[PDB]
């Protein structure tokens, strides 16, 4: 009776030591992965400077990825973009078109195969086990060239700060499918550029949008990984506060049961002594 509350106090006390140690683990990981996010932010800028940013395109096939976390102590990160997945997917699919839903991170393969299972063709995980590299993001992007859609929606959490995480969608338009048509402004906007490459522009743009897919997929899962470590740093501060309020309330519950216990057996001794004396 009185020992069950005593070792449950021992449960919540070092859970508050686990979740306080995990918060600084997630904060040290947030600090060293913050400089890689700032460096990868540079290369995504020349491609939206060149190819623009066209989210609401009319496609016949679209590969949408949702970049989730791998370990799931992040507290509201991977569930938020699966809300933002269908809020973006159902916005752009009302034409009876093909849709392939990919997930980076196995917290999406447990979350997207129950809300969109008929359109789920790929699940990628273990991308944060060692580190995120561009060659790893190139092979992930290479499997998105197997299917040949007209757009590539990339759902990820942009690392705004250690407090705020803006969910960001980014689209990559296939060259001879939709990119050459969505730049037509009384002629073309791309005809102002002089191609100084080997073959014709239909092969330069095929090499560029594969580069543009691989660059923004390297940045997406690197932005999302730094948002994973910084939302875990806040979800574990809310766990030490919850396991310190639970421990402070259960200490008073033990102290009331401690005081009632010494009063109870002492009354049992006086009642047995007054029967004899």
């Amino acid at each position: 009776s009185n020992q069950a509350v005593k070792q449950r106090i021992r449960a919540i006390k070092n859970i508050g030591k686990i979740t306080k140690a995990m918060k600084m683990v997630a904060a040290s990981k947030m600090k060293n992965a913050q400089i890689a996010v700032e460096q990868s932010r540079g290369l995504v800028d020349p491609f939206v400077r060149l190819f623009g940013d066209f989210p609401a395109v009319n496609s016949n096939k679209s590969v949408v990825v949702a970049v989730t976390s791998d370990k799931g102590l992040c507290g509201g990160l991977n569930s938020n973009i699966t809300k933002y997945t269908r809020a973006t997917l159902a916005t752009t699919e009302s034409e009876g078109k093909d849709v392939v839903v990919v997930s980076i991170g196995d917290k999406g393969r447990s979350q997207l195969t129950r809300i969109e299972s008929q359109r789920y063709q790929l699940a990628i995980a273990d991308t944060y086990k060692v580190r995120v590299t561009f060659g790893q993001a190139s092979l992930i992007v290479e499997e998105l060239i197997k299917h040949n859609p007209q757009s590539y929606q990339i759902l990820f959490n942009k690392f705004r700060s250690a407090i705020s995480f803006k969910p960001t969608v980014a689209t990559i338009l296939s060259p001879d499918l939709l990119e050459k048509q969505l730049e037509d402004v009384t002629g073309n906007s791309l005809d102002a550029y002089d191609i100084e490459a080997s073959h014709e522009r239909s092969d330069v743009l095929r090499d560029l949008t594969e580069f543009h897919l691989g660059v923004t997929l390297y940045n997406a899962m690197l932005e999302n990984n730094c948002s994973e470590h910084a939302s875990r740093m806040s979800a574990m501060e809310n766990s030490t506060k919850s396991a310190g309020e639970m421990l402070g309330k259960l200490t008073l519950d033990y102290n009331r049961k401690r005081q009632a216990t010494i009063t109870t057996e002492l009354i049992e001794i006086i009642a047995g002594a007054s029967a004899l004396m």
């Binding site: 030591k17 306080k20 140690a21 600084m24 683990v25």
Partner: peptide, 8 residues
């Protein structure tokens, strides 16, 4: 002493 049982 809680950090001793960690890998990261």
């Amino acid at each position: 002493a809680a950090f001793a049982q960690f890998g990261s």
